[PDB]
Symmetry: D2
């Protein structure tokens, strides 16, 4: 089983603010880009269910910032499976600065998504998505 799923992003000017570093919200956006790239590549049919009856909703998210990223930096975001609780999936995120080559931890994050049906009713994690997560056991 693979330990992680890697997402890479080149930091551009819009990611930064007047202070000179990457604005904190962008770290959360990278969690979104990462988790949804995983869905596109590892569980395509699950996405089709979302336009129907399936509803994947973020229940919580968080991020801790150790060091700063700058413009034209390359960030490597590694997502790992923390655990599954019936309908809830918890992910872990590790942010690395890999601009000069060697990776250096600049931030650590975590978020939880819930699988529901269109009010909203908790439903067990779809088998396709469930099989995809099996290769990323902690």
């Amino acid at each position: 089983m693979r330990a992680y799923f890697e997402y890479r992003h080149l930091v551009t000017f819009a990611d930064t603010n007047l202070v000179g570093n990457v604005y904190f919200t962008n770290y959360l956006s990278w969690q979104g880009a990462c988790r949804e790239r995983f869905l596109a590549e590892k569980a395509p049919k699950t996405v089709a269910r979302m336009h129907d009856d399936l509803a994947l909703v973020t229940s919580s998210c968080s991020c801790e910032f150790f060091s700063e990223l700058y413009a034209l930096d390359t960030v490597s975001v590694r997502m790992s499976l923390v655990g599954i609780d019936f309908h809830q999936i918890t992910m872990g995120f590790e942010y690395y600065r890999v601009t000069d080559g060697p990776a250096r931890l600049v931030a650590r994050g975590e978020q939880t998504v819930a699988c529901t049906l269109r009010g909203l009713t908790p439903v067990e994690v779809p088998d396709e998505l469930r099989t995809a997560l099996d290769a990323y056991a902690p």
Copy 2:
């Protein structure tokens, strides 16, 4: 004769250079036009959850002087014209204290279509939306 959208420029609007990143000016067009829809055309809005689709045909903006963090910008929207199913809106951006100072100028066009299974077929501007826009006609 204009519909105003006021916005306090915060750090996220800025970049490492110090000024407001140019894409935010287009974002303010969206916030303005949709705040307009919420206040002036509720029936048109409620209809969008059904068979009505508003698609942006084109957009543009011209920049004269820069906005900075914690500045207050007055986005002022006016009706440029209506061509059957297409609505063209004009935007003027004002740095507002003292007298208001023009810092930018923009424009975008929105088309009204019927969301059908075959595709998006152009429908004339809804009566509610047209009369509401005429209040800001030249």
Copy 3:
């Protein structure tokens, strides 16, 4: 005892699911904390162009209910505590017709620092910013 930031939810705030994308909740914290600086701490703001830097050390948000397009959200900020150089802010998100409805709840921590020689350097919260946050502290 809270500082309010009101926001009209527009189409850009939503995604294909129909609700507000979760990152926007964090954006509203930034918009709220910086509106606070502009209105309650001008001396601290101008000092940031000098040798003062406010770095975000952590943030989080819990989501109870969904916000939709053209909803009005009341982002209410209060002081949780201060530890030397770090400020922890609490956030409550309310859906505002009728009575206000809590839809989310978050928190973030900001550290004050010097732009000195070896980069960032921990600094006790400026007196201007310290007394400004007191008005929104549980007291």
Copy 4:
């Protein structure tokens, strides 16, 4: 080739309640593309920006032909339209390349001015930036 390419996977944050990509994102991609270009083709020019050189966006625009959707892959193709002493005009073509075949979905354009950083003074486009731009001339 005849264009500098910026490839982007459309994720959920790019979309709105309708299901298509919100129009402002097309402009965001112009910024990401131009700044990725600068990082790879004009590193010394980038270095000048932290000193006295300032590239100011004077205008931008985009024309939308057909919609992009979630998990689409878009190919943003930037070419040189013209250089007027200190002003650079870039052209952008947006292609859906999801399933493989490329289809034009949008076309944009923006102009940047090379100035010096009181007051702004026009300065001729740096030779490094100029010769790098010539590779994508019409």
